[PDB]
Amino acid sequence: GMDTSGKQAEAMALLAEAERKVKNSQSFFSGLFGGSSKIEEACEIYARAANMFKMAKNWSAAGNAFCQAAQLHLQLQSKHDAATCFVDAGNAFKKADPQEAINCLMRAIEIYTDMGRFTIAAKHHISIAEIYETELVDVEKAIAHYEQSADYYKGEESNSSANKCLLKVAGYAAQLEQYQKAIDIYEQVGTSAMDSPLLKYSAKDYFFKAALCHFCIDMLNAKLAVQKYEELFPAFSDSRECKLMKKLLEAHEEQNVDSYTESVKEYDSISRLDQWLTTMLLRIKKTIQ
Amino acid sequence: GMDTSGKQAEAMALLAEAERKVKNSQSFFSGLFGGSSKIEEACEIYARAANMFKMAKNWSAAGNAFCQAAQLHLQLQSKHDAATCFVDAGNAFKKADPQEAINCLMRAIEIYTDMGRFTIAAKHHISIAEIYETELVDVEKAIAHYEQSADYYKGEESNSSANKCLLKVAGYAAQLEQYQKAIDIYEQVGTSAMDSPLLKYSAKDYFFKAALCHFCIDMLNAKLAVQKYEELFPAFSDSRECKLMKKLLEAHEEQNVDSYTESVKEYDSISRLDQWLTTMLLRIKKT
Amino acid sequence: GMDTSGKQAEAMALLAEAERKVKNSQSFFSGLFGGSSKIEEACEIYARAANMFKMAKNWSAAGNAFCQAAQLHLQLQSKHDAATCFVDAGNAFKKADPQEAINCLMRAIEIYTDMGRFTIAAKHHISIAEIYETELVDVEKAIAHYEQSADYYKGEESNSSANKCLLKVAGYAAQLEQYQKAIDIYEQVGTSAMDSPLLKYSAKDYFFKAALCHFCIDMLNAKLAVQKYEELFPAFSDSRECKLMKKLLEAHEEQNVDSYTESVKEYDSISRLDQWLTTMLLRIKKT
Amino acid sequence: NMAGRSMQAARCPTDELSLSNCAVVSEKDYQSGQHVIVRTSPNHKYIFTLRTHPSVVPGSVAFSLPQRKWAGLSIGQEIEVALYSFDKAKQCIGTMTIEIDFLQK
Amino acid sequence: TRHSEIIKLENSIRELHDMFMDMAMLVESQGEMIDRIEYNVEHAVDYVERAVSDTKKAVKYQS
Amino acid sequence: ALSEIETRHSEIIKLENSIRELHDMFMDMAMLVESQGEMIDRIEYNVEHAVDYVERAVSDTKKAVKYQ
Amino acid sequence: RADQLADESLESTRRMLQLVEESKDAGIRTLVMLDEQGEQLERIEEGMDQINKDMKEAEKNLTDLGKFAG
Amino acid sequence: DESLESTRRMLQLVEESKDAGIRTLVMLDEQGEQLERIEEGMDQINKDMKEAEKNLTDLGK
């Protein structure tokens, strides 16, 4: 398209113009000492070139120009604008180079928390964890970022966001990490919703999950925890999950794989699986001996 | 970990430079009369020091710094910033030690009402009531704060917000063996929910509660109340609550405790109750 | 106001004293060259005259005054105000005569693109596309506008808005019988929706629509496509859409009209259909 | 041609050609009698005999319904078609066993 | 046939219940965001008004 | 068995009522939330315009101060 | 076969009653909740428009004053 | 027989409610999406206005 090629041509022209402008800017500071306008107009040229270049469908050099302009703006003691440009460069690099985007976003996060804005820092941490885990296969760093975001949210009584982050962290831990953290977080989130204005009945699932983890540890712990939750939370007593867990435990007690298999099959037929309970149940069945 | 230890180290450093700032700034004001910029700079130093204390997970000292900044700023003849600092100090003191949080939040409410903004004042009143309820047992102060918040919300035509506070107050009053306030609030809210295109479904619910509490006095008055509510709400008889209450009345008339208890247990089986209703029913059964 | 036409005549006179102002620009500003603020207040009177024209329901006059104010104010300065005035003129022109609204919106689009504001630009692109659809008959220009707006949205990871715009574009293309684009879009959006739990309940509809588009072109490949969809999503067959599609395709092997006629009638007996599906079926099942 | 070219599948234009079992082609692409291997996948190769017809649009081969299905050819689909040469000294069918059944009940 | 249709009803009611379980948390989170944005905007308006008014009086009266 | 079918008749009546309450209820939901969506769109547009205007305002004011 | 008839009927009635009432009360609480966000949005809209007017008038008058000074 | 037509009515109402609740979910999601952008814009304007006014007041001295 003509629009593309023209945009790239004018972008190269204006990048060369910005380079010569900054070099002449260094010359003029000593030559005439006009102050600091020269650099700020150079930064404006850089920003315009970068924006119209990312309209040219090309990203990497757009983000590079964003980073360079942000640096040449921060060297004039201006921070918030430089941090916003850092975040924009990270967004642009998201589709160009994950490492550069991550570095720029870490710089933005540190400068923001230095300013004193926690919610923005937590949002950026969540974005970092999401981009890190979606394309790069790794969790522990994602777990740490999610925990930091939850801590930042709890610092300003943002209960819902922190709850969602803790739930995700506990789920990840249960899938891979040891089950003590998962048990604690799941039980706490389940018991922090007994007086929920709108979620007065959803905690049962969480309780069930906790019980499943306990049954992952041992049968004795499984039954003790199931009882504890039964007495502590009366409603879970009449829950279908309670009957299913009792049936599964009693079947596993007598070592009859047919009963366990039929129970899980009928449960799945009655209600669809979720792809997380199925793996847990398969692991439990693997240890039936 | 190491982040917190560092934050605390450079924060102690910053507090040292901040006390130096205040001392040298008053000295410079006395000896040179440089204006008031230095006081503002000391205020921002206090603010950032308190913020990094919060990042360092030390809430008591962060709240102390916030209070100091607030008092110095209001000494600088500025309130809104001082009020913000005071509310931040109260939030910091919420956990750990909330006692001084009460006083600082009261000061914030006082300055807000002196300025004349009501909604934030009512929000802070309900927050203080929640603090009293959760951390203390002096339910009377909670009642006072809740009723003041309800007055504010109702005066500003925020009926929905006022109704929640009124229901809380009615429940608490019914808890402490006082039923006049509970009866009045329950009946008033039930009447106000009559013509709501949305809330009409629950108009019955509140009414039912009133009758139960009204039954705490005697039998005939309860019968009169239920029949009157039924005439006022023609559809009220459709629900089971009226049937259950009639069962209770007839069983209690002829000292039929067994039928009373069995009907209560059956209603529990079909639909379980809460602590409030269970306690009220057992108290009623006591006679 | 129905009786506010005396002051709208006075407002034509106000635009006239704006004319006196441009006469000052012609002759008097030689000595009032520092009266750039005077030109600004001239634009201000322009704007408020236009505003009461809007209040008087004179859409053509209001739009003309808006455009004149925009042109006068865009003296290579305050481009944002010029863009706001142009979009206001376009909104005024939306009713009555919308053609010039198109050009003024295009100018505002260019201004915002130069500035770097994208969501507003894409929203105005959607606005011009919909005004094309509802007033004029051109659809290809609307298709291009939707494509451009979706590109702008996807540039900043605005996935949902671009997805809906592309769904509308795919529907139009299917109506315009360009089935490759339609299938690509319907299935890209279906596979994207199925990725996250919050929308996994919608993928079935997209898959069914995509299957119809596929079944439109190549019967022999329709079976393979539906099998691929079924294996990709185990819970696609259970949906009534897959069963109905299987019934239609297997009955189409033999020339019995009654079979598919009764199948479609039975399906319609459970819920009404829409114009798009009914038209597509009527066209396709003819052969 | 010799190396093969990407092409779009087409429907057979005439009944006689469909009965001929010959892959109908465009005169500007292939010549009548030529044998071409249709690559629908790395492991899916089929051999067809080419017969020209005026209505064949350039860049496509008309396939009858039996041919398409047997070879899984979708109308409007892309396949790789390359000239295929028989080894007549070894690939001249001397005896072919053919199963016959009524085409329509 | 009654068994099949009641199993269909079982399905549908289960999905409806799950869908409400879904709506609830999203709505609550929206409200939580709303409260914070409201607080911040009120702070901003108060600060803007007082700062501009005081600075204007101070820079207008000294002359 | 007669009592069973009578109870099931009562149940079907109750089910009709409850589905006669939930449908209208959901419609109320839909209309109210659509209004909320329109109004949030409006306020967001206005906020963004104010942001741009104030940014350019500070830029121009600082340049004018620099002229001094 | 009446045993299975009765068992399935009891199961069906219990499940329908419980799910119906739960969905009812759920949507009910959502209904009660939405109005708070509605009025919050109203109040914030009022505040933001007030901000916009105040800042606009302030800046225009200040540009006028600066022009007068120069 | 009335039971069967009642079952048909129940199916119709249930499927209608589901088909509308799905789009209720969708539109709730876009509202949530808009909230973050508006909040970020608000915070940015607040940050810029605060810095600007404080710097100008400091220069006034």
Which conformational region is residue A35 in: left (phi greater than 0), alpha (psi within -120 to 50 degrees), or beta? left
Residue of chain C with shortest Cα separation from E15: C201
Question: Can you list the alpha helix ranges (DSSP code H) found in chain C?
Answer: 5-26, 36-55, 59-73, 79-94, 99-115, 119-135, 140-155, 159-175, 179-195, 203-217, 219-232, 240-251, 257-268, 275-285
- C16 close contact with D: CB closer than 8 A: no
- Reference B120, options B159, B80, B89, B160; nearest CA is B80
Give chain A positions within 8 Å (CB) of B91. Answer: 157
B-chain residues near G39 (CB < 8 A): 158, 160
Chain H's closest residue to C203, CA to CA, is H22
Residue with tokens 């779009």: D8
- Of C236, C234, C226, the C-alpha closest to C203 is C236
C217 in contact with chain D, both atoms CB, cutoff 8 A = yes
In angstroms, rounded to a whole number, what is the distance separating the alpha carbons of residues A185 and A195? Answer: 18
Distance CA(C229)–CA(C231), nearest Å, equals: 6
Neighbouring chains of H at 3+ CB pairs within 8 Å? A, B, C, E, F
CB crowding B4-36: b at 16 or more within 10 Å, else e: eeebbeebeebbeebeebbeebeeeeeeeeeee
Contact C8, C52 (CB under 8 A): yes
E24 and C CB contact within 8 Å: no
Region of B182 please: left (phi>0), alpha (psi -120 to 50) or beta. alpha
State the amino acid at position C217 in one-letter form. Answer: I
3+ Cβ–Cβ pairs closer than 8 Å linking A and G: yes
Q: 109-168 in C: which are within 8 Å (CB) of H?
A: 119, 160-161
First vs last Cα of chain C: how many Å apart? 60
Q: Do the Cβ atoms of F25 and B200 come closer than 8 Å?
A: no
- Find the residue in G nearest to A199 (Cα): G26
Q: In 3D, which of A206, A204, A273, A264 has the Cα closest to residue A240?
A: A204
Chain A CB contacts of H47 under 8 Å are 80, 115, 117
Q: Does G63 touch chain C (CB under 8 A)?
A: yes
Distance (Å, whole) CA A270 – CA A189: 27
What span, in angstroms and rounded, lies between the C-alpha atoms of A98 and A104?
10
State the residue for tokens 């819970």. C235
Count of CB atoms situated within 10 Å of the CB of A123: 20
- Contact present, G51 and E44 (Cβ < 8 Å): yes
Tell me the C-alpha distance between C77 and F1, whole Å.
87
Give the closest-approach CA distance of F55 to chain H in angstroms.
Answer: 7
Phi/psi at B63 (5° precision) = -65, -40
**Distance of alpha carbon A214 from alpha carbon A230, whole angstroms:** 14
Residue C143 makes CB contacts below 8 A (sequence gap 6+) with C169, C172, C173
Separation CA B173–CA G11 (nearest Å): 42
Residue A270 at interface with chain G, using a CB cutoff of 8 Å: no
Contact E49, G54 (CB under 8 A): yes
* Spatial distance between the Cα atoms of A242 and A248, rounded to a whole number of angstroms: 10
Q: How far apart are CA G16 and CA G18, in angstroms?
A: 6
Q: Which residues of F touch C117 (CB under 8 A)?
A: 48, 52
Method: cryo-EM
Spatial separation of the C-alpha atoms in residues C222 and C239, rounded to whole Å: 18
Q: Which residues of E touch G48 (CB under 8 A)?
A: 41, 45
Subunit contact B199:G32, Cβ cutoff 8 A: yes
Interchain CB distance below 8 Å, E27 and A202: no
As a three-state string, the secondary structure of chain B is CHHHHHHHHHHHHHHHHHHHHHHHHHHHHHHHCCCCHHHHHHHHHHHHHHHHHHHCCCHHHHHHHHHHHHHHHHHCCCCHHHHHHHHHHHHHHHCCCCHHHHHHHHHHHHHHHHHCCCHHHHHHHHHHHHHHHHHCCCHHHHHHHHHHHHHHHHHCCCHHHHHHHHHHHHHHHHHCCCCHHHHHHHHHHHHHCCCCCCCHHHHHHHHHHHHHHHCCCCCHHHHHHHHHHHHHCHHHHHCHHHHHHHHHHHHHHCCCHHHHHHHHHHHHHHCCCCHHHHHHHHHHHCC
**Pairs of CB atoms within 8 A across C/H:** 19
Report the gap between the CA of G22 and the closest CA in chain A (Å).
9
Query: In Å, how far is H12's CA from the nearest CA of chain C?
Result: 7
The residue to which tokens 């247990």 are assigned: B265
> DSSP H helical segments within chain A, as ranges?
2-31, 37-54, 60-74, 80-93, 98-115, 118-135, 140-155, 159-175, 179-191, 203-217, 219-232, 240-254, 257-270, 277-286
For residue C200, the SS3 value is coil
Distance from the Cα of G56 to chain B's closest Cα (Å) equals: 22
